[PDB]
Amino acid sequence: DSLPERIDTFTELFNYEVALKSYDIRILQSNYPTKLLSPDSLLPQTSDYPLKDIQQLYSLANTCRLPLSPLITEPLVFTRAICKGTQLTPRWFSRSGLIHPGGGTYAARYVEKYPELRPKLAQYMHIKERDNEEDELLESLQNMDDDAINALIAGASMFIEGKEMWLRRGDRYFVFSKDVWQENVANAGLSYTLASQSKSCFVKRGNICWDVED
Ligand SMILES: [Cl-]
């Protein structure tokens, strides 16, 4: 038929009423903001901060003995609270950028100093900083590779999370079992390769590099 047309046919073989799970995209967005799912949040934040100011903030946090920069005003109060032992409310976390200029969240660093506030501030931590002390959606999110999580952030058509496949259909994502989606791959006339394990990924849908079968 066509490689891209076979992927359109692939999505039509699914029964979106007998899906193992289903998630409203707007609900998922309010429970998990992008900054708390994104792999870039765990990195030093050189895209939003100048490398020189990141150095000065880290030096102030290491010693506890306020640099002049236009962006470091919010990170500076976090450093003050950490050094002096003062409090920051959940209101503060909800209105912050959530991400510390050195990577990771403000809520995880704060909970490292006050471990008893973990339940109150868990929703402000990155999914990779949470231990899941309460969750099925959090567990699926945590087991997504960087390409699958970034494809969920972007609203991509589909992606493989472990053994299950998530497929978008409007404002929801439907999750299907390994047996159901693998048979549809053969029923459509397709082969797949994970983006992380492929040399070339020219027909990419999320975390999936599609090809024809033989
Ligand atoms: Cl897509």
Q: Tally the helices: what do you get?
A: 10
Distance between the termini: 14 Å
Q: Write down the secondary-structure element order.
A: HEHHHHHHHHEEEHEEE
Anisotropy-based shape: elongated
Q: Any idea what the radius of gyration is? A: 21 Å
Structure characterization notes:
This protein has 214 residues and is of the alpha+beta class. 41% of the residues lie in helices and 14% in strands. It has a four-stranded antiparallel beta sheet with strand order 1-4-3-2. Strands 5-7-6 form a three-stranded antiparallel beta sheet. The longest helix has 13 residues, at 51-63. The PDB classes it as signaling protein.
Descriptors for this entry?
214 residues; alpha+beta; 2 domains; four-stranded antiparallel β-sheet; three-stranded antiparallel β-sheet; 14% strand; elongated; binds chloride ion; signaling protein; histidine kinase; tetratricopeptide repeat; monomeric; EC 2.7.13.3
List the helices and strands and how they pair.
Blueprint: H1 3-12, E1 21-24, H2 25-31, H3 51-63, H4 73-84, H5 90-95, H6 106-113, H7 118-121, H8 136-142, H9 146-154, E2 158-161, E3 164-169, E4 172-176, H10 178-188, E5 190-194, E6 204-205, E7 208-212
Antiparallel strand pairs: 1-4, 2-3, 3-4, 5-7, 6-7
Helix pairs in contact: 1-10
Bound molecules: chloride ion.
Chloride ion binds near residues 157 and 205.
